Amino acid sequence: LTTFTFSGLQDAPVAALSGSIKLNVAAKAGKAEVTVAAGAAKAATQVSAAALRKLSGSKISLAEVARISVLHSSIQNYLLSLSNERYQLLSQWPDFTTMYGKDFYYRAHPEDLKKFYDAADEYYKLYETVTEFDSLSALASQVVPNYAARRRSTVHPAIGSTVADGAFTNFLLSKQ
Amino acid sequence: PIERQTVAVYAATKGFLDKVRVQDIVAAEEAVISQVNPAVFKILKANGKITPALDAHLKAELRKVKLPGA
Amino acid sequence: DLVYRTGQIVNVPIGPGTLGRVTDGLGQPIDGKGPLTNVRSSLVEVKAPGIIARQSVREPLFTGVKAVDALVPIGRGQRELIIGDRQTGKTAVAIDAIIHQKNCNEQVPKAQRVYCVYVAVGQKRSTVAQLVKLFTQTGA
Amino acid sequence: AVSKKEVLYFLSSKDAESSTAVKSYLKSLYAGAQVEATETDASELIAQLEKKYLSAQVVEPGVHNIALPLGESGSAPVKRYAAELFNLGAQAGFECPFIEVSKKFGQETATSETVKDVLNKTKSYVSADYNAALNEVLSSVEAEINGPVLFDGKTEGFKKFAAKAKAVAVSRGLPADTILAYCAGSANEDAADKVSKEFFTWFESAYTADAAAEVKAIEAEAASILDRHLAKPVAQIRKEQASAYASLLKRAETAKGAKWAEKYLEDVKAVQWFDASVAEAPASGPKVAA
Amino acid sequence: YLAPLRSDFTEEITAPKVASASNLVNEWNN
Amino acid sequence: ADAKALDELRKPKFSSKYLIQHVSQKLIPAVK
Amino acid sequence: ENDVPAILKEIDSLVSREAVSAKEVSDAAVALTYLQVKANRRLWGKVLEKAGAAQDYDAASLTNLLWAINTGGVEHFKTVAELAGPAVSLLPSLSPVQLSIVVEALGGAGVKNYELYNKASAVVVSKIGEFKPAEIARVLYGVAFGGVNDVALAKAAGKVFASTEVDSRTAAQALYALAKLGRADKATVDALLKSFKKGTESASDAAAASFALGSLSFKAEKAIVDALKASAGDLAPAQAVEAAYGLALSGATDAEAFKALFGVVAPAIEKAPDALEVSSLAQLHVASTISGAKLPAAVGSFVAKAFGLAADAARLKRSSAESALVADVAAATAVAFGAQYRPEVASAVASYVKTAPDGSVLDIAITKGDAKVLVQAVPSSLLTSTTPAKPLGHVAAYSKVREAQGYAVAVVPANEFEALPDQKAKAQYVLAAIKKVAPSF
Amino acid sequence: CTVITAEPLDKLERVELTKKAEKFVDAGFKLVMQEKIDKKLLGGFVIEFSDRRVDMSTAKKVEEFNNFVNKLVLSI
Ligand SMILES: Nc1ncnc2c1ncn2[C@@H]1O[C@H](COP(=O)(O)OP(=O)(O)OP(=O)(O)O)[C@@H](O)[C@H]1O
Ligand SMILES: [Mg+2]
């Protein structure tokens, strides 16, 4: 945000848009009767037109408290988001334990039953590793250091090929 | 490894591998390295010598072995 | 043509960064894995260590070849000739000394581990690529 | 403490540990300490070198504070990600990426008067897809006069090469007339205003496509790393990672007294605070001082 | 969770090397 | 031990910044 | 029954649930500004966390949210800059009174979105009569602070500010937008300057017109100055600095206006000296010098070092087309003072680089006994963006601080210096400019 | 001799250069000179004596600087 801000009590929101919280402002020429109602609680104060202008004087400047970093947490959130797409297809696995009875054991070929008991031991291998979510935070650290070295470019952190080709067209198609 | 070399040379120089056909001494010692105790190699590697507490204890453990033909 | 002197007697990169790498006759790597990191250039023609810098060769180098370690055993600090005709197994005695050191280096403390160097002079490049394939597969 | 050229580089920086080194320096300068006279020394090659290692101390914590827009839909997470790296360039002393890579061209080719050498030591900075599509036009125009095309501009042997390289620049998609008419300029401020609004329409579609190509490679790397990891049994995973975690601790523990190693193990202690502060109240999160 | 620290620069300006689609949605559907 | 700060919790943790500082403190005094 | 902290807990439980929509996160933000909740930062953090998560966004809830972010003074760049995705998709769906709040909030936060401001200025010039004068200033504040030097809008806004006279807060936003664009149009600044003796109600718009006049270097207003001297308790210490800096640069010397402004910033720096930016501590030392109104003994000595700090930091991070200009002007200063050969000019410009008294480094600092001159190159970033192209007010800021250090600053601007064809013409341009300031040389 | 420079010399660039160059002849020898130009050099000069050359040009001082700091960051 800048140093001086020019908004407050002019072209303001007059009312809430939801029903979860009920806002009612009553603007006079000088001050305003706001009435807020959220849940069981209610509040109603008087906000001057020069009381909202002092609000943006000292800025809040929110910042994220991350376990490791904001970069790492965004890679780990993507690996958690990718593990969800693989967990959703282990959700659609047929219930093999409905065929564990001995009327399926003895009607079945002895080699097609050992394949069935191996395909059930395989699902527990796949499912116990897709729910190993404490391993996603160390897979995110295999993505970070190679990315962070591409950002330590000697040209610019935000440089890429399309810009650097577009600035070769300016460099080459001008005089020497 | 050097401990399985000297055990196999012990099995040939202490007369444990005559009564064995000369064509399959190659396959006879493959039993001898694998059928004696895997703990008797560790003592010979740690000592570096076949001690008096081991040269009988291994040559009496080179009798509880199954050799081809015999 | 203009030939410039470099001021330096012939040198090669020495150090632990040469381990695992396939270099040429002047130490430049030919395995295609970039420059030799963690390395230092030293002369190739050094005066050999004299009488007062030696001590007696007492500890064994195990070849792993039992015709060798029983009959013609090799101490550490001893030059041993492998002489024979062609295709009699001279490399196989030498390769088995290198492969066996890998098996022994996993069991000994850090002070007594043997780091092999194989110099392949005048051989085929296919023969050398078969040896670094064997040494990668064995772990040597 | 900081060496007073770092703290001049951390004034416009906005990460945490650089600003707390600034704020404890400005608190020393409130208690009457003398601001040390900065050096009018360190000639041009040394000044370019320590600027490179001071910008990389503003860029390196700043890159770790920029959330990648992985798996997002739309252009505004990619335009946010690009704009955070623009501001990280400006905070670290870089100019615009157009002005930074063009300075890289004219510095690398200050000795060249032929085009085949200009297209050869600006090889690291342009696409090989674009370096080849200019070397095809160059070796046809040098197969037309049978003399090397000069980097002169007033030579007509360059003029019909530059008229064909302009046809290559549209064949990539680059508006070659728009880019040229921005970095040249115009007299009136109204006719140069309409060419800046269509350069910046190219430029924003240019740097979005470099950020979005960077996101699509992190997305593809992470999906490749995960699918290699989802094919492992769990006992392999926990000991592959505990081996990699413990090997990386002792690389920081055997490092005697180095500043990066104390800061490494201070951050392992701060991760374990984060895991412990969340265990005390998980619906709240970590405890901050309020 | 921790990474190897690296202090090196990128001198090229290249494309970022998009890796290939791993076959695991098509192996787990098999 | 609890409730550290905010400005201490905003630090990115395993950034380099101190390898970059270390190789700047042994290069610039060595190339001068 | 009037429960303000018990309604914060009822807002906290509205945004801490799982599927908060856009309207519930708009109105949670709107209710936090009307309640003035700067003290609770985590509750503002839970609202902007759900403001990025919220996917649907109609025209009314986006502008209620962006109003609340802007008015509340809460900044988080990642959240606000990704709200420019709803905005460029709702932009034909936006009211003209709503498009002014979007572009003011996204522009005032620094969102680098060229597709937004191109389409949002092309709308506001396609329907120029459809926008009231407060809305054309809000868009002008946004496109200027979003990094777009759109002078097509600054002309179309200038025709509106000439046809109708505007509110005081409307004009001071328009002055602040033209100050960052660096325009200094006499035709439109004076049309906005008459709005400031009808009575202004805020001190933030008296201080921002103060800053915008001094940055364009016009002059003080004598009712902006006298609104600022009464209501300098409404201003934050980073805002009173930019008022006193902007009054000093315009040539005001009303010392009672400066006692009011320095009565804010002095106990703030004494309470926490690291509270302000070092760019703002340097803007205090310019203001504590040109008007001459002094400061406390621990403050004015402290902001004197922070002019030395903030001047090297802009010299270390020099634009490298400014580094070309300084080494070009210093070479012409070698030829003007007598050096016809290259080993002479190479060893002369290494003698022009003496250190300033505050610890700084001056680039072309010539010393002849007691009289010292200083040559100042003013590239293009410190020029106005208009066709006369006089330098901005910040170069007279840097001049008067060095002039109060024993120098005689000769200004060499690159619009005049680089229209010259050879080095001999550029030598007598520098030699005339040095002798115009101290003719002892 | 042969001196190769970047652009043609001054009359003071001539006089400062012999003071460099008669410290490359190891007795009471006199150098004549022969002046050539090459903008592949970025200033400085190359003195060629037909049996030795000495390159105090800054175009090689760049490369001798770069390879010193490309060797030293790999040693840290
Ligand atoms: N101990 C062994 N047991 C079985 N086969 C062996 C043995 N040693 C070598 N051979 C085989 O004999 C062949 C010759 O071996 P090797 O290549 O080691 O000989 P060489 O002395 O290196 O010959 P050259 O270098 O002249 O080609 C190889 O193909 C190898 O497979
Ligand atoms: Mg052989």
PDB file of N, CA, C and O in Angstrom, chain G residues 354-373:
ATOM      1  N   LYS G 354      35.229  12.075  -4.183  1.00  0.00           N
ATOM      2  CA  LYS G 354      35.458  12.272  -2.760  1.00  0.00           C
ATOM      3  C   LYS G 354      34.230  11.904  -1.932  1.00  0.00           C
ATOM      4  O   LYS G 354      33.098  11.883  -2.414  1.00  0.00           O
ATOM      5  N   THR G 355      34.478  11.618  -0.661  1.00  0.00           N
ATOM      6  CA  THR G 355      33.432  11.227   0.266  1.00  0.00           C
ATOM      7  C   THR G 355      32.738  12.446   0.860  1.00  0.00           C
ATOM      8  O   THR G 355      33.368  13.471   1.129  1.00  0.00           O
ATOM      9  N   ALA G 356      31.426  12.339   1.006  1.00  0.00           N
ATOM     10  CA  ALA G 356      30.616  13.367   1.620  1.00  0.00           C
ATOM     11  C   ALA G 356      30.874  13.411   3.123  1.00  0.00           C
ATOM     12  O   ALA G 356      31.412  12.460   3.691  1.00  0.00           O
ATOM     13  N   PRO G 357      30.536  14.526   3.789  1.00  0.00           N
ATOM     14  CA  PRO G 357      30.746  14.595   5.247  1.00  0.00           C
ATOM     15  C   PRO G 357      29.889  13.648   6.071  1.00  0.00           C
ATOM     16  O   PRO G 357      30.298  13.301   7.184  1.00  0.00           O
ATOM     17  N   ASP G 358      28.730  13.210   5.580  1.00  0.00           N
ATOM     18  CA  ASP G 358      27.850  12.349   6.362  1.00  0.00           C
ATOM     19  C   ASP G 358      28.194  10.873   6.234  1.00  0.00           C
ATOM     20  O   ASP G 358      27.442  10.035   6.731  1.00  0.00           O
ATOM     21  N   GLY G 359      29.306  10.543   5.586  1.00  0.00           N
ATOM     22  CA  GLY G 359      29.673   9.177   5.303  1.00  0.00           C
ATOM     23  C   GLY G 359      29.352   8.719   3.900  1.00  0.00           C
ATOM     24  O   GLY G 359      29.720   7.601   3.535  1.00  0.00           O
ATOM     25  N   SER G 360      28.686   9.547   3.103  1.00  0.00           N
ATOM     26  CA  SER G 360      28.263   9.156   1.770  1.00  0.00           C
ATOM     27  C   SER G 360      29.414   9.276   0.779  1.00  0.00           C
ATOM     28  O   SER G 360      30.559   9.532   1.145  1.00  0.00           O
ATOM     29  N   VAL G 361      29.115   9.060  -0.499  1.00  0.00           N
ATOM     30  CA  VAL G 361      30.090   9.181  -1.578  1.00  0.00           C
ATOM     31  C   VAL G 361      29.496  10.057  -2.659  1.00  0.00           C
ATOM     32  O   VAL G 361      28.446   9.729  -3.220  1.00  0.00           O
ATOM     33  N   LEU G 362      30.158  11.166  -2.948  1.00  0.00           N
ATOM     34  CA  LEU G 362      29.790  12.025  -4.055  1.00  0.00           C
ATOM     35  C   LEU G 362      30.592  11.632  -5.274  1.00  0.00           C
ATOM     36  O   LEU G 362      31.746  11.230  -5.169  1.00  0.00           O
ATOM     37  N   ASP G 363      29.979  11.767  -6.436  1.00  0.00           N
ATOM     38  CA  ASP G 363      30.591  11.214  -7.630  1.00  0.00           C
ATOM     39  C   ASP G 363      31.463  12.208  -8.373  1.00  0.00           C
ATOM     40  O   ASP G 363      32.503  11.825  -8.910  1.00  0.00           O
ATOM     41  N   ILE G 364      31.053  13.467  -8.468  1.00  0.00           N
ATOM     42  CA  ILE G 364      31.834  14.506  -9.139  1.00  0.00           C
ATOM     43  C   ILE G 364      31.944  15.661  -8.150  1.00  0.00           C
ATOM     44  O   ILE G 364      31.176  16.621  -8.208  1.00  0.00           O
ATOM     45  N   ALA G 365      32.917  15.587  -7.252  1.00  0.00           N
ATOM     46  CA  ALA G 365      33.070  16.554  -6.170  1.00  0.00           C
ATOM     47  C   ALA G 365      34.430  17.225  -6.297  1.00  0.00           C
ATOM     48  O   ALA G 365      35.448  16.656  -5.898  1.00  0.00           O
ATOM     49  N   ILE G 366      34.439  18.449  -6.813  1.00  0.00           N
ATOM     50  CA  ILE G 366      35.661  19.202  -7.077  1.00  0.00           C
ATOM     51  C   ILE G 366      35.906  20.138  -5.905  1.00  0.00           C
ATOM     52  O   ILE G 366      34.983  20.821  -5.451  1.00  0.00           O
ATOM     53  N   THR G 367      37.141  20.180  -5.416  1.00  0.00           N
ATOM     54  CA  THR G 367      37.493  21.006  -4.268  1.00  0.00           C
ATOM     55  C   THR G 367      38.673  21.896  -4.623  1.00  0.00           C
ATOM     56  O   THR G 367      39.758  21.391  -4.924  1.00  0.00           O
ATOM     57  N   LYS G 368      38.467  23.210  -4.584  1.00  0.00           N
ATOM     58  CA  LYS G 368      39.530  24.191  -4.819  1.00  0.00           C
ATOM     59  C   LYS G 368      39.711  25.023  -3.559  1.00  0.00           C
ATOM     60  O   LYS G 368      39.127  26.098  -3.423  1.00  0.00           O
ATOM     61  N   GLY G 369      40.552  24.537  -2.655  1.00  0.00           N
ATOM     62  CA  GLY G 369      40.775  25.232  -1.408  1.00  0.00           C
ATOM     63  C   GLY G 369      39.601  25.079  -0.470  1.00  0.00           C
ATOM     64  O   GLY G 369      39.398  24.011   0.114  1.00  0.00           O
ATOM     65  N   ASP G 370      38.823  26.145  -0.311  1.00  0.00           N
ATOM     66  CA  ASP G 370      37.620  26.098   0.507  1.00  0.00           C
ATOM     67  C   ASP G 370      36.360  25.881  -0.314  1.00  0.00           C
ATOM     68  O   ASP G 370      35.476  25.134   0.110  1.00  0.00           O
ATOM     69  N   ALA G 371      36.267  26.511  -1.482  1.00  0.00           N
ATOM     70  CA  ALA G 371      35.085  26.377  -2.318  1.00  0.00           C
ATOM     71  C   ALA G 371      35.037  24.984  -2.924  1.00  0.00           C
ATOM     72  O   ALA G 371      35.991  24.544  -3.571  1.00  0.00           O
ATOM     73  N   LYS G 372      33.937  24.281  -2.687  1.00  0.00           N
ATOM     74  CA  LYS G 372      33.688  22.973  -3.263  1.00  0.00           C
ATOM     75  C   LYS G 372      32.466  23.081  -4.146  1.00  0.00           C
ATOM     76  O   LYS G 372      31.448  23.631  -3.725  1.00  0.00           O
ATOM     77  N   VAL G 373      32.556  22.576  -5.361  1.00  0.00           N
ATOM     78  CA  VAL G 373      31.364  22.396  -6.158  1.00  0.00           C
ATOM     79  C   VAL G 373      31.090  20.912  -6.246  1.00  0.00           C
ATOM     80  O   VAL G 373      31.948  20.069  -5.980  1.00  0.00           O
TER      81      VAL G 373
END
